[model samples]
Target chain A: DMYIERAGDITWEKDAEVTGNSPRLDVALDESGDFSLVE
Target chain B: GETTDGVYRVMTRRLLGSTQVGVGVMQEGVFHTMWHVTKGAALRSGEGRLDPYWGDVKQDLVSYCGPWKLDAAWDGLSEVQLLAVPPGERAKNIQTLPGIFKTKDGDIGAVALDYPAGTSGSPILDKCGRVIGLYGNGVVIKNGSYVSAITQGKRE
Candidate 1:
């Protein structure tokens, strides 16, 4: 039920579902200073 | 420019219905929001979007996550940070306070914080800045704001 909107010369598509019924919402910072949510 | 990094503003719309706004977070390349924020909007096939509020950037939500669970026995006096979008504000704001976790029987199992409008789905961050819960309800007693704790379990 979700889709991305595209602009000029760009196409949007649905990739995958995150947090697919995972009870734990644990997240940690990666080496590159990015957030990573652990299921 | 203010950097939210993982925090975002959430908006949900239902055709010919009402619109709801709150806060959300992006982790591991996916969107996580509160159930109440999208409950009404997703009633009749609605749409939800996440806005970083810095530029023309937007992210679509594939599915919704839990209202989460409240830790009834959570540390009452532990300092916690609340991340939310104040009323009429497009950017994220962080409020620091100790969470009140004690509740009477038949009471809503949630961590109590401060009263702020338009803070639905606000993330309750621990001392380490990790999200521990999501803000949803408001309790008039002591002007407390309630947050549903995110627990570890299987989603139905």
Candidate 2:
């Protein structure tokens, strides 16, 4: 299932970096270098 | 004892005066940077002085700010050219500093950048292509330290 959320016309790319075999998913705000990881 | 004795006496007086007063001493030192950044064909200029304690302190200080103009088709970036040494003074072994651009008004802009040593001078273009400020001097002051910018700001 794909869900889209937008705030102030800013949309985040989820699962942006997909590693087919990797178990963890990571997301980051490219500008400030802040990041998060999801299982 | 009062009438009969003949007295021979030699008396010499020397006058001496003493007063105490307070005097203030002032010492001045110039701030120098060997680095610079620019946009839109800018020129760098300044003089050098030889201090008794600090040896030779050279300044490529900017005597002139610029004739920078707003132009389109330039990607909103200011084009800057810098000359550390004037044409005639090229033989003086003067060096240049690297250039860096900072956003004057932005949340996630170039906040701070390091100026490496031995960098003569170079063009620093921003993402917007504007010449914000010149960066020079590998010497970095500790953050939050108060730097005196005027004579009255300093104390003995």
Candidate 3:
């Protein structure tokens, strides 16, 4: 899910929790952070 | 009128449309996997202030709607992007709820708050610069910050 419904609804991931998980066109990783982890 | 379950809910909408694409409220559920819905018509509500205009009752994604042409809802989202448009010139509609957050006084509402306080319908993008979700009213804040761009049809 590349879409974020809200920033306040934003969640962050552990430092390296999404280490390998980078945001893609279809697949995304939003582990409690303001911004997505785009590679 | 926000938190219902342990999950914080938010009111939301968009200038976007039906395309199997996600709406402003999808991330909250998808992230945690709110799949396997019970099936019901989360009608388009308009009686309450700070209302979830097109509210979804399933797990209570307040005011959340399609990408849905389900049970009873027939309305689609309307996308309005602030990232590209200036405040004074931003598009307005009943659903966008412009004045409240993106007030004339502020070039942009909630933008200063980093994550915004009361802006729903904000467009969330993916790493490829594609919009993913929208800003919902679920954050612990009283106000919300928000998104723009529609995935299908055309941006009104």
Candidate 4:
């Protein structure tokens, strides 16, 4: 059983994106509950 | 010399050192008697209150009421009736669980377990096994032995 859970979703704004972006990054929990984002 | 109305004063002195020795002995006896009487009163009050719930188990529930003095930094006096529930059937109640580690002004000082419960004629000891105060009738249980601590102010 999960003893604790995040209460709500976290969102990042586009204005805070890094310069010289290689690719837009979209991340979410993976099959093992892990994810990554890049821009 | 003009004296107001009728006034009389009587004074007597006795050098009975022998009688003084007898009085000293009697004073000691009286002191002992007083000690026993006070001790018996405290013990009897504690034992009488807990007699109904005190089973064969040697558990103790101490209750004491005193002014929990707050430092000058805070407002007026904050009195509380502290209850030390021993580890047993009665202590299981959530209300009696030791919460609110510190008071508003007074430090969460050492817990005392020196009071006596009426039902069980035993002394209550604190977490570190020290007598703090007497256990008596202050805590109340409502609805199926669910005990609650009784204090002067609201529980924060």
CAPRI accuracy category, model 1 = incorrect
- Score each candidate by Cα lDDT: 0.37, 0.19, 0.24, 0.18
Per model, state how many residue pairs clash: 1, 15, 34, 17
> Model 4 reproduces what portion of true contacts?
0.00
Best by lDDT: 1
DockQ of 2: 0.01
Better of 2 and 4 by lDDT: 2
Which parts of model 2 are misplaced by more than 4 Å? A1-39, B1-60, B63-111, B137-139, B143-156
Instruction: Return the clash pairs for model 1, or none.
Output: A23-B153
lDDT tens per residue, model 4, B1-156: 111111111111233221110000001111000111122222112122101111111111211122121111111122222222221212210101121212223322111222223111111222332222222212221222211111111111
- What lDDT, from 0 to 1, does candidate 4 have? 0.18
Model 3 ranges off by over 4 Å? A1-39, B1-55, B58-118, B141-156
TM-score of chain B of 2: 0.21
Q: Write the per-residue lDDT of candidate 3 for residues B12-33, one digit (tens) a residue.
A: 2443441121223333222221
Q: Mind listing the fnat for each candidate? A: 0.00, 0.00, 0.00, 0.00
The full ranking of all candidates by lDDT, starting with the best, is 1, 3, 2, 4
Candidate 1 chain B weakest lDDT stretch, 10 residues: B53-62
Candidate 1, residues B1-156: lDDT per residue as tens digits?
Answer: 122236555433433332335655544434455444554243221254433212100111223323222222324445445554554454333444332323221221244444344456556555555566556543333223233332211222
- The DockQ score of candidate 3 comes to 0.03
lDDT of 3 by residue, A1-38 (tens): 12221223222112211211111121121333222212
